Amino acid sequence: SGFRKMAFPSGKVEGCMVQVTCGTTTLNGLWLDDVVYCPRHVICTDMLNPNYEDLLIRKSNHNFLVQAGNVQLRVIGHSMQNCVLKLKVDTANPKTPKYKFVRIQPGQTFSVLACYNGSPSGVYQCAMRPNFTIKGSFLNGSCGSVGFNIDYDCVSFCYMHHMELPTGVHAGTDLEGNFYGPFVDRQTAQAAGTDTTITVNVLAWLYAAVINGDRWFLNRFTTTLNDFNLVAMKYNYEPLTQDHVDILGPLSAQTGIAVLDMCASLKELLQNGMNGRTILGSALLEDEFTPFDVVRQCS
Amino acid sequence: SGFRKMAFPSGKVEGCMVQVTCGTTTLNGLWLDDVVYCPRHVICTDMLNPNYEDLLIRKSNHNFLVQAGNVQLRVIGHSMQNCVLKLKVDTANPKTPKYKFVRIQPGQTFSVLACYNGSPSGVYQCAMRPNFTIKGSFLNGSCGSVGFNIDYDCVSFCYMHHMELPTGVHAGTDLEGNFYGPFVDRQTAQAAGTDTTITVNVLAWLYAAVINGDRWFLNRFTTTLNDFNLVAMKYNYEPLTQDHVDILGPLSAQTGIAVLDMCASLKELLQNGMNGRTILGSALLEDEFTPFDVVRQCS
Ligand SMILES: *[C@@](O)(C(=O)NCc1nccs1)[C@@H](Cc1ccccc1)NC(=O)c1ccccc1
Numbered sequence A, B: 001s002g003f004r005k006m007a008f009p010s011g012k013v014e015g016c017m018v019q020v021t022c023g024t025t026t027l028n029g030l031w032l033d034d035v036v037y038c039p040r041h042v043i044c045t046d047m048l049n050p051n052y053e054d055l056l057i058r059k060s061n062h063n064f065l066v067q068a069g070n071v072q073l074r075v076i077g078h079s080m081q082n083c084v085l086k087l088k089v090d091t092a093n094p095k096t097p098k099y100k101f102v103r104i105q106p107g108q109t110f111s112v113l114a115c116y117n118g119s120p121s122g123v124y125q126c127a128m129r130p131n132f133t134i135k136g137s138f139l140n141g142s143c144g145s146v147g148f149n150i151d152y153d154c155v156s157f158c159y160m161h162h163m164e165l166p167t168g169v170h171a172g173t174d175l176e177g178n179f180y181g182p183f184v185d186r187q188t189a190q191a192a193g194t195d196t197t198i199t200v201n202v203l204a205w206l207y208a209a210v211i212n213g214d215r216w217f218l219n220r221f222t223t224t225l226n227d228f229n230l231v232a233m234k235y236n237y238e239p240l241t242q243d244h245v246d247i248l249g250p251l252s253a254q255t256g257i258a259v260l261d262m263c264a265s266l267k268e269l270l271q272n273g274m275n276g277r278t279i280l281g282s283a284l285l286e287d288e289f290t291p292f293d294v295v296r297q298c299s
């Protein structure tokens, strides 16, 4: 019993993290087979509007210093793909897990291994927000840290941390180097849009709470998809789709509570609040558990 | 920026987790040097009131099956220490980290690596509650999972999971096999006492929030230690000591807010609530960050 915000075991990623230095910029890199992936602004000193192409021109393989713990790696190639650099090294990482690079959708969750100078500091669970930011915990030197999911022995890398916005939220790329959302790797006038709540996730957490003993919010009412979406638009919740209803099926089946009945419970929680009660230890509705996360944790 | 509930990187522990089977009971074990540590109720089928001594009598080394991934380990010795078994195996774990066994105090936090059948499933941060339980997330088969802290390369094991109480909270031992609190490894009429809030931790989280931009709760008032403790007793918060004031010094120094001024802010939050605002993304006061956790994360 219990429901907690849980990350995947981080070991398979820890073995991949290295330190990359270029001139005087040190950040974190990700070493998989014979390539080290890092943010491209490792070649920068500038940040107002860098011509990354022209900055990479003054650089050769020997200008990139890659250190894996204490093992110094020999760089034999370098290229820019979008906003990442790929440093070919002469040795395969013996520690490379089975892995895939994946571009996730807003609403999906992942674990983050925060790193500084190539060394892991902590692990936590995050979500890609609807506005394509993540609410992380990152400090200077954290760029190059990565987000991932682990299915069986396979690591699905989905995020590389690049930057912190003036709002205190975080922006970054997939492992192909394309940013999530509209952000650019410059210090410019960029700011997060409207962050909306992830309705399908809230419902799944409501299901997690029933499985674990919290049921005061269960009402004697039901609703319709269109009726609920009117309420969600008012409260800046994302619209709920029949695809979302279908994904919640297994949770509906386990608990015997129909998705539309849970929607009417959420409806009442949105118009009435919690009246000083808590659900799974929180006085706010939680939207960073996917339906898959509830099933995995509760089974 | 950002403040999140963060666990230590779990890799050093993942390499220590094994599967222990005795008869038909399988649970998790912890393999360090040439000893595997597991809960002693691996030798049980009973649970009402087991005579553990007499159950261990019918067992020999070959009755304990230890599997580390797919490597089968050969047991050459066994003993009972308090509520754990120590299985001597013929090979040292090549993956053994530098480690220490530590009995932590209520109020202290640690990371938990939840395991099933010797395989890690997730990592999360927990605290030893004042009533010597932990509010974990554990399912059948999770016994033998461990809690730990990591300072530099040294793993400080502090918890082994044994049991879930009828209340849905969790109880377990240090790695010497002594339970935290009064619990016994039996299915009997045992229940958690009064859980109180960890005042020194709440204050440290209040400091974390100021560091990160949340300051609406900062008041134009101060208070005294005795005055505050009257308020804390009413709201079932632990008494605050001069030792606690001293531990918060570095956070006081960074932010320039005196501990007793923060106490007056907490005072007002306790008598008035949050009036529908949030602090660091929560509408409840958080007590599972130690002062050390705030500094480590915010630096
Ligand atoms: C990285 O870009 C980085 O850490 N990005 C993510 C952040 N999260 C919170 C704050 S920053 C590094 C690259 C770098 C630059 C210069 C020296 C060493 C590393 N950027 C910074 O660390 C940085 C951030 C803000 C102002 C100056 C420097």
Ligand SMILES: *[C@@](O)(C(=O)NCc1nccs1)[C@@H](Cc1ccccc1)NC(=O)c1ccccc1
Binding pocket: A001, B024, B025, B026, B027, B041, B138, B139, B140, B141, B142, B143, B144, B161, B162, B163, B164
């Ligand atoms: C462990 O004692 C165990 O998992 N303890 C911690 C728990 N947290 C939440 C639920 S239980 C195992 C040992 C065992 C016994 C029998 C077969 C395999 C393993 N106990 C249970 O898994 C168990 C719990 C509750 C009822 C029956 C069995």
